Amino acid sequence: LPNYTNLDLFHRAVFPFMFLAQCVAIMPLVGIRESNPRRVRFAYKSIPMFVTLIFMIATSILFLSMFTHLLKIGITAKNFVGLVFFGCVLSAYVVFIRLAKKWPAVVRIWTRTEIPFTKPPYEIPKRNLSRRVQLAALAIIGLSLGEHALYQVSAILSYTRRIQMCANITTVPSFNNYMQTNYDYVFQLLPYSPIIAVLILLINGACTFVWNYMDLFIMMISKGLSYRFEQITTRIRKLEHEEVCESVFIQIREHYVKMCELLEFVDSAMSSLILLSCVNNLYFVCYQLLNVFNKLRWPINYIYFWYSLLYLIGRTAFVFLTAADINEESKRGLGVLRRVSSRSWCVEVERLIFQMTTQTVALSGKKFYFLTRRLLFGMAGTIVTYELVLLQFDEPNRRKGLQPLCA
Amino acid sequence: LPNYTNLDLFHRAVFPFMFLAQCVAIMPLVGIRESNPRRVRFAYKSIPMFVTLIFMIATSILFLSMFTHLLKIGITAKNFVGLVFFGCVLSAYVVFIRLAKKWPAVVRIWTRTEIPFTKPPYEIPKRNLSRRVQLAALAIIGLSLGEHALYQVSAILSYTRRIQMCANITTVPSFNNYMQTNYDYVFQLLPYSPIIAVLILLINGACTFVWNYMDLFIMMISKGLSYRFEQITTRIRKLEHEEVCESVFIQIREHYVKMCELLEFVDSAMSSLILLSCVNNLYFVCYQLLNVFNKLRWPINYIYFWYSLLYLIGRTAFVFLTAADINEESKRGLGVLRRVSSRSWCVEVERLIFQMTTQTVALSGKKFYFLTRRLLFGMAGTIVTYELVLLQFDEPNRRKGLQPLCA
Amino acid sequence: LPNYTNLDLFHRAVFPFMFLAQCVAIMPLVGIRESNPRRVRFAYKSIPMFVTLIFMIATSILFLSMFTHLLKIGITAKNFVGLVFFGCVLSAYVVFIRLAKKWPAVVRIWTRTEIPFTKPPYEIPKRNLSRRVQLAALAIIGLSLGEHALYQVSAILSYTRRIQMCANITTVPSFNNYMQTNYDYVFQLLPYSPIIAVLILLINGACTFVWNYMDLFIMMISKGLSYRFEQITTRIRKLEHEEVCESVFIQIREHYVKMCELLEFVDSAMSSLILLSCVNNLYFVCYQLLNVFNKLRWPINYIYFWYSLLYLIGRTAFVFLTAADINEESKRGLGVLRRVSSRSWCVEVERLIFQMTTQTVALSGKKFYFLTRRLLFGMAGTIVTYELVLLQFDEPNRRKGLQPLCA
Amino acid sequence: LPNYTNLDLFHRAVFPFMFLAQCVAIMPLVGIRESNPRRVRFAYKSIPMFVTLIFMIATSILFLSMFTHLLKIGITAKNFVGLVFFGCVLSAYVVFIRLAKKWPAVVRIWTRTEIPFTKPPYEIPKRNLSRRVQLAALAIIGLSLGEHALYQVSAILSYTRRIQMCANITTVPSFNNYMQTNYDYVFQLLPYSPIIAVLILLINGACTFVWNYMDLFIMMISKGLSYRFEQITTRIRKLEHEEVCESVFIQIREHYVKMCELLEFVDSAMSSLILLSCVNNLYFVCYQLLNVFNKLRWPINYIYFWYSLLYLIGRTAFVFLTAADINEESKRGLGVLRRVSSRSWCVEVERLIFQMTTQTVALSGKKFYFLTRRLLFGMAGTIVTYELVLLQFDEPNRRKGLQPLCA
């Protein structure tokens, strides 16, 4: 069996971040850190599943808290976002659990599909798969941490500044008063306690991490697939000005077909996650864009809002672009295959060219749409249309303006 | 001739529900229960056609009643739905009559097209065609019965609760007073009578059954076609890792071509029904979605509205997905055909792959659109756009709020 | 040379209606009635061109009259339609003149392209080209005459009924007073005279005929092309269950390629007319649809408005469907070519199937769009979206209601 | 080495206008006027880069002036256009700098790709590349000069007429007072001085030239590519009725593949410029179209507004059409290749036909969209939808009307 310890495999590239997600109980798999992907298994009776149940119970508690609070104070389009967040997070857990159920098979096939690309005539690119995954995942994680830190800083500064410059009822600033005020949707259902306060903070952080990790996981999977497609493209490019025997084209076509089979399997496994991430990203992007013209009190509020909006748009665009890189890489070999000489042309090259030309090699949202650059352009156009139609809805709200600080 | 009694044929699978629809005079065919599909014929002078004429006359009476009532009280976008319902139902009858005219030919060809798939190398899947049709049809019928029961319960409870808690003019609750009130659009044209009351109730039930049976029939036909396409895909999958002679590919391509010819014939026969069902579903889904934010008096009213909306959306999505399963199954064999070895590759495999790749194997609405997953995604996007643009139209109505119970 | 007198050619089919259009100076060609299409020529110094100049001068006079009248009374979205009409008509003349410039070449090639289809193995369908053109053109002409008659009747009845039931200033009804009132946009610039009145009526009738003849001419051309494509499809169908030699496929492919070349040439010639007709139809359909909810005084006003709206929508749909029948007929032979036996399969069948599959055989609006069923569906969706967005613009106008009859 | 002095090459065709753009420091390349394209190089330490830095510093000064002025007076959707202009211009500089970085490689490959087309069997068309580029560039430059002259004339006439017919506070017209008034967004940050006034006028002219030169450069590049594609199409047409040896098709396919490689390279180089130009054109076209119904004081104001709107729409349409001419020319050879005889048909013709049919030979905006006639039609439809939705936003502004002249 191959030595998985040092090989440049997808599982080795992604298992650190899969374990980081496990820490917040995202995808409950057993032995995700094992070097051999064959040792990855899904077990309902396991510590990861127990932590997942705990986190899902707590997220359900938070979702019920938000639902009851909004019912008490009435549901508004602006309030609803909160519920949606928790809803999405809960959905994510369920989706990821199902994904975990399918992950072993997937990872197994993935490994056995990518062993041929770890040996000649395929070479490791300048940026190996582990480095690509690390760079993208660290960027996403750092940006999400910055977004949540800005959220917390904006909330705390708004609360403290309101109290300080209120020049009216004081309610001296404190951790407990802030916890009861900003998170009143929770403590209006559960008795307040500092331990519960820290728990709610940690659980909100975990929910935010899950919310970002849906997109992060889609990104890592897209990198893993486009890496092998790029290796195939590079191998084909190496045949640019050479007479190529039929056997070379046979092997290239077989490897491309295996890569497409792996893409189909992974797409079937991940279609639910892709659909959930796409719908959640669209909703949140539209909601934040509808608030671009709103007026906020403090400069920190503007900083947080614009950082969140830009980060969300960039994360959506980056996930879509990373997923579409699979399609772009699949099509990139067509230009080199079209240069095959008349002497080297054979039935195998014709078959491969036909498959590259007519097959859509891309991740899909349950085959309702395919993650391509054209899809990202259409999503941008749809978002623009929705924003144009919706900015009329909130025009009265926009002209309401900032409320009095004292009130 | 083949023994139709026990064979796993489409006609055997669907004739129970076709006869159930005949009971409400949907598709007036003679000998629909006959085991031999060759004995199915369309006759204008027949009991099914007489019942169809009676039901169409009664539906025309109801439609005229609604038209005159709305003219008397003025036509509003909210009132119009009622007329549309009856209109659609009447259209359905006409469409189905035409479909009946074409059904014998269709069924005949269908039978002779599916005889090859009842013998090796094709095997019956885990869920045979009869079981698939039964499951889907029973689900649709039960959900429609639940929807109509909730409609009746909501109307009756609203009427009775209004009268009881009116604390004003009493008009003690009774069957006759409810019949005159809720169905005043009928009795404002016809003299009231309990027999006419029961007749109107039964006729409204029949109209609802027709309204749901358009989608149900499209679903059963889609199941019948995708069943044979799935059998072809399974047979191709059985050739995954074997050297295949040219004769096997010849037979596979011929069976696929026959299946596509059957799909073309059935699509030509059913294009009118598909178009009518699509337009009716779109209109009703948009109309119900425009009322999501409206305020209803009783919890039963909310239960009925949301059950109806969710059932309608799910029925539209399920019909579209079942129809698109034909296209998905047709394309599913391409992946296996792309794995054919260089030794087994021949002109027949190339022909079949070209046909699967470039031909759109799907039901269509008169070729204006094709029932695919992409079409369902586009329909969802179009519905979202229409709802966004239309929620401004009814904003004044939404802010009107609930009327006084006494008034 | 072939005997053009009795042959079933496009020129013989369409020249009666081309001459009818010449009577109103639409397409100024010389010798359009000649049996030999080679005798058709375009001459600037000719009676048709003189009549075209006279009609264009008259239409410019009417357009200037409308422009000055609207400037005097201010331009409104409702008034603008009038100007647009004349503008379109003027554009049509120019376009048709250019079309006339290209018609001889076109007709010549057309004739020499369709001679092979007048002899075996091609047979004349049940409805020959002359009968198809006659039926469609007579339907369009009769419906346009009915539309204009309803327009005149509605205007005259509105005027006379207003005067009669005014119960105020009388201005006894007369031809001259009606001419000065309804056509005040003309006589406000030119001194009134009964001769000028009859001239304005005749010139308005000619403008209406041109407005309808753009669509009519597109329809006849589409019939001419789809006729030969249908003949090709029928010839291919005749090879359904026969072993076919390579020569038969060679001839079929050559005839199909010649038909596609003729379609390309005709599309290049007629792209301007197609674009103008499409834009004019879209504008007028949207404008009329925006007035569906408006309230009109008399039942004749409703009759005229709804006849005009239904006729316009039906004419647009029929032109689009007739043009798309070319594409449908081109694709109809693919199903029969896919049934070719393995023994009869050759490079010629593969070439023909590839061309039918991948080539878009359809008329186009300068290649910006192609006249297909999908395009008609997209046009319907675009019209629905535009109407939804625009019904908000005229909501104040809709709630204005009918003006007082006396005022 | 080939004699570049007299050859009909792209670099010879475009270098005069590239140098004209260099005069305003658009694309800082060294030796752009050199007859040998191999002598074109990009150097940060060079006079072109120094002038580019000066112009970018000036444009940043103007952008900061506009930003501070709008902050002082509040940002409105109408004011924002100004900022956008400068922003785009600044972006253009950056983009063009990057383009300059890539230009040498590009031009080099371009030259070596187009040497084969300067010799038989390719002939120079009636309009050689230099003449096509000269005509289009002179048209664009003259129209831009007219647009800016109309802008300046409208501003000056509005200012002078206001002062003269004010009949109130006079502030006798002068160059300095006009400079301080119309360009108050500048002098509100920098102390006024006539030298600074002339500098601001010249720098605004340079910014306008850059704004138009983005589209102009895209146009010239599109002409350069479609020229060679048209030469290929003409060479193929020359084989219309001849038996063609396999070697001729080999050479034609190789030249077509080289042209497609050049298109891919140029598209990769110019995708940023195409995206920026497309977004800027869309924004400005929508903004100007939103002001069509606004009321302006003087006839010169209407003349300037409509000249600017028509010129902008025509420039967008012309850039899109010139870019799509590459795709149209690539597809134009398919019709002639489909006429190849059965005797001359070979694997090379099949390969070439497959590539022309299935490959999208067009410039693209980073592969998010492709510059085709269909894309221009979709852009027109999107603009219409945006204008319909947006005309509701500015309806209050439209009904505000013209402000008092004295105020």
Ligand SMILES: OC[C@H]1O[C@H](O[C@H]2[C@H](O)[C@@H](O)[C@H](O)O[C@@H]2CO)[C@H](O)[C@@H](O)[C@@H]1O
């Ligand atoms: O809207 C994006 C933000 O979502 C989360 O914020 C939660 C918050 O944690 C929770 O207390 C409240 O009930 O709902 C919001 C979302 O509506 C993230 O914590 C933020 O970083 C995001 O900006």
Ligand SMILES: OC[C@H]1O[C@H](O[C@H]2[C@H](O)[C@@H](O)[C@H](O)O[C@@H]2CO)[C@H](O)[C@@H](O)[C@@H]1O
């Ligand atoms: O709107 C969906 C409902 O359609 C039917 O309800 C009819 C009703 O039977 C009839 O009396 C009235 O005139 O019109 C409505 C439809 O507008 C079904 O009976 C209901 O189950 C559906 O919910």
Ligand SMILES: OC[C@H]1O[C@H](O[C@H]2[C@H](O)[C@@H](O)[C@H](O)O[C@@H]2CO)[C@H](O)[C@@H](O)[C@@H]1O
């Ligand atoms: O709007 C469709 C109608 O167009 C013509 O009507 C003209 C009319 O002849 C002319 O006097 C007036 O100035 O403008 C209208 C069009 O705006 C046709 O004559 C009518 O048949 C059409 O209904």
Ligand SMILES: OC[C@H]1O[C@H](O[C@H]2[C@H](O)[C@@H](O)[C@H](O)O[C@@H]2CO)[C@H](O)[C@@H](O)[C@@H]1O
């Ligand atoms: O809007 C198109 C116009 O853009 C430029 O005009 C500038 C102007 O030079 C500058 O002083 C001002 O600050 O902004 C506008 C653009 O918003 C061109 O100079 C004009 O020719 C164009 O019409």
